[PDB]
Every structure is written in structure tokens, then in C-alpha cells.
Curated annotation (Swiss-Prot):
Glycans are attached at residue 79. One of its GO terms (cellular component) is extracellular space. It is found in: Secreted; Lysosome. The gene is CHIT1. The chain holds residues 22 to 386 of 466 of the full protein. Residues 1-359 form the GH18 domain. The keyword Cytoplasm does not apply. This is Chitotriosidase-1. Belongs to the glycosyl hydrolase 18 family. Chitinase class II subfamily.
Length: 359
């Protein structure tokens, strides 16, 4: 079973105990570590933070401590947009420029592979033709990696992709059966099913339904049914929650009217979301479990937050095993109580649970 964990290069800027650097990583915690995020310049893979080149070395250097560990560099992300991906896949020449820059970039900095995080082909401004151009991008990368491995004698670079759970996104840009053949594994973003973009409260990552496709189960069945081999479908797990501000402190149920995103967390400072350590830090709040969906939520006054705890993670791992999936993925290392300072459950409470349950 794989335990794919995402690292974010902007977490290094969080204040105090929330600051996260490569040194804060437990090298034996996960089987695969993915570095988010790399960018693109003139169709060539490039860094996004001023000190990435140093972080890359510390990141990948961890493999000296654990030879089994594998690392990948993720390109894209939500904030990155789609324009650069669209222009890059527009012609055979641009794609070749990109593919060559990726291999050199990965080999130079000691990454074992590339994780594609285009969000998303065929959506967010990306035209319909990008659905098939994305398939070609995947095949170009796969063919190039396979070739480089043959000519260099080096282990083939890995190729993965972080994909959406929403039916609309999946249908708008993913030829699942085709890309699944060229990808070593698929990181299913089984979260963000609900958020403050809805005028009603809803859980970030419910396992089952209480609209009926907005749950982990439906997403998993969708990617499997569309052609994804079970062993390559890695079920994403969120170490953060989605928050809302209630229309009234008088109705705190799931589906209760909401006025918008919840108050930003003290350390993550982004309304609509909260790290796990910021949630287990809520004082005077009331926690409840959504029987149907097997996940919890907590509220206080006009604030409501749907998140994942040790219990739901254990339940989702039992679920993935029963479906015979390739393992679990987690976003993100810096959102779990990585230093065990906020939740009094030790270091990496949530991710350690995934590891323990998977093993």
C-alpha cells in the first residue's frame, strides 16, 4: 500500500509553531513524498519559491536516510491556473520543450518523478480541446520517461496526476481509461466536496452521501468505473477542514444555511479552511459526527467546520482496503498536527493513523 504525502513550499512562511520546513518531515512516515508546487516559464518546468533549490536538496536528501522513500515534484495547483498548461500543450513543439525540461529538472534535483496537478483540463478557463491534449501530454511524458530510462539505464521516472472527484470536472477533462494506462498512480482528491462556495453547510470529505455523488465513495466508484485500475487509485485524505459562518447560531446541522466562509484560522489565515491542528485547538466548541457520512464536524456560536479526525481516517482506510485500492494520499503534511503541539495526540496524529492502519 502506498502512503503519498504532499509537502507545500509556502508552509515555510507560517508563523511560530505552524512554520513547516523539510526538517519537519518524518522521512519514514510516508512511502512517497510529493513537493508542491513547481511552476512553468516559457514552457519549461521552474521553481515557484526563491529558496526551492535549497529545499529540493533537503527534501530529496532525506532518501539518504531512507533508501526506499520516493519523491516527486508536483506542477500546478489551484492558484497556478490553467493558461500556462493550455499554451504548453497547444503544440507538439511546446510539449517537447516541457517534457525535456521536466526530465532534466527532475534528474538535476534528484526527484524520482513528476506529479501533474493541472486544475483542471477543460475547466477553470481551460477549453474543451484540453481534455485530449492532456491525454497526449500524459503519453508524451510516459513515452519520454520510458525512453530516458532505456537510454540512461536509470530507473524510470514516475508519473502521477492529482485528479478531481467532481463528476463535472472528471468528464470535462479526463479520458480516464487512456491516461490511467500511462500513469503509475492516480492521486484522487477525495475532498473539497463541499465548501463555503455553497450557501448551505456541508462536509469537506464525507465518505457516503447523507448531490448524491458528492462523497468519497461515489468519487472512487467513478474513477474505477471509468477505467482506473484499483492498484493505481490512491485515495486522498484531508488533514484540514472546510469552514462556514452560519446564518444563525440556532441551526448548526449539516445542510444549515450559511452566509459564507468561516473565520480564518490563526496560522493558516485563509477563510473557508482550517488546519487540523487549528480545529483541535477550538475552545468551547461542540463536536458532532455525521452518522451517514462517517465524518465529524464542530461548531461554536456562528462558526461551523467539517473536518477529518483519527476516527474518520481509520474508517476511510478500512474502506479503501475493502475496495482493494493502491493506498492513501494526504493533503497536507503541514496541516496535520506535525509537531504534536496542538492536539496532544503526538506527532502527525492523522497521517500516523493512515500509516498504522495501512500497515
Amino acid at each position: 500500500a502506498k502512503l503519498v504525502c504532499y509537502f507545500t513550499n509556502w508552509a515555510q512562511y507560517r508563523q511560530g509553531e505552524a512554520r513547516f520546513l523539510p526538517k519537519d518531515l518524518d522521512p519514514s512516515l510516508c512511502t512517497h513524498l510529493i513537493y508542491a508546487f513547481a511552476g512553468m516559464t516559457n514552457h519549461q518546468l521552474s521553481t515557484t519559491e526563491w529558496n526551492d533549490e535549497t529545499l529540493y536538496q533537503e527534501f530529496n536528501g532525506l532518501k539518504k536516510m531512507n533508501p526506499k522513500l520516493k519523491t516527486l515534484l508536483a506542477i500546478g495547483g489551484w492558484n497556478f491556473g490553467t493558461q500556462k498548461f493550455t499554451d504548453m500543450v497547444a503544440t507538439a513543439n511546446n510539449r517537447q520543450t516541457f517534457v525535456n525540461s521536466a526530465i532534466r529538472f527532475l534528474r538535476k534535483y534528484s526527484f524520482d518523478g513528476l506529479d501533474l496537478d493541472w486544475e483542471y483540463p477543460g475547466s477553470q478557463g481551460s477549453p474543451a480541446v484540453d481534455k485530449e491534449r492532456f491525454t497526449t501530454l500524459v503519453q508524451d511524458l510516459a513515452n519520454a520517461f520510458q525512453q530516458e530510462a532505456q537510454t540512461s539505464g536509470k530507473e524510470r521516472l514516475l508519473l502521477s496526476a492529482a485528479v478531481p472527484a467532481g463528476q463535472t470536472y472528471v468528464d470535462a477533462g479526463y479520458e480516464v481509461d487512456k491516461i490511467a494506462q500511462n500513469l503509475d498512480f492516480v492521486n484522487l482528491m477525495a475532498y473539497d466536496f463541499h465548501g463555503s462556495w455553497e450557501k448551505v453547510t456541508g462536509h469537506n470529505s464525507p465518505l457516503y452521501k447523507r448531490a448524491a455523488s458528492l462523497n468519497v465513495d461515489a468519487a472512487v466508484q467513478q474513477w474505477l468505473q471509468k477505467g482506473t485500475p484499483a492498484s493505481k487509485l490512491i485515495l486522498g485524505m484531508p488533514t484540514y477542514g472546510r469552514s462556514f459562518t452560519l446564518a444563525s447560531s440556532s441551526d448548526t446541522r449539516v445542510g444549515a444555511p450559511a452566509t459564507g466562509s468561516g473565520t480564518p484560522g490563526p496560522f493558516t489565515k485563509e477563510g473557508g479552511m482550517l488546519a487540523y491542528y487549528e480545529v483541535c485547538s477550538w475552545k468551547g466548541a461542540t463536536k458532532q459526527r455525521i452518522q451517514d457520512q462517517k465524518v465529524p464536524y464542530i461548531f461554536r456560536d456562528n462558526q461551523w467546520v467539517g473536518f477529518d479526525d483519527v476516527e474518520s481516517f481509520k474508517t476511510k482506510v478500512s474502506y479503501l482496503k475493502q475496495k482493494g485500492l493502491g493506498g492513501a494520499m494526504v493533503w497536507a503534511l503541514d496541516l496535520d498536527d506535525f509537531a504534536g503541539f496542538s492536539c496532544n495526540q503526538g506527532r502527525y496524529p492523522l497521517i500516523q493513523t493512515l500509516r498504522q492502519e495501512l500497515s
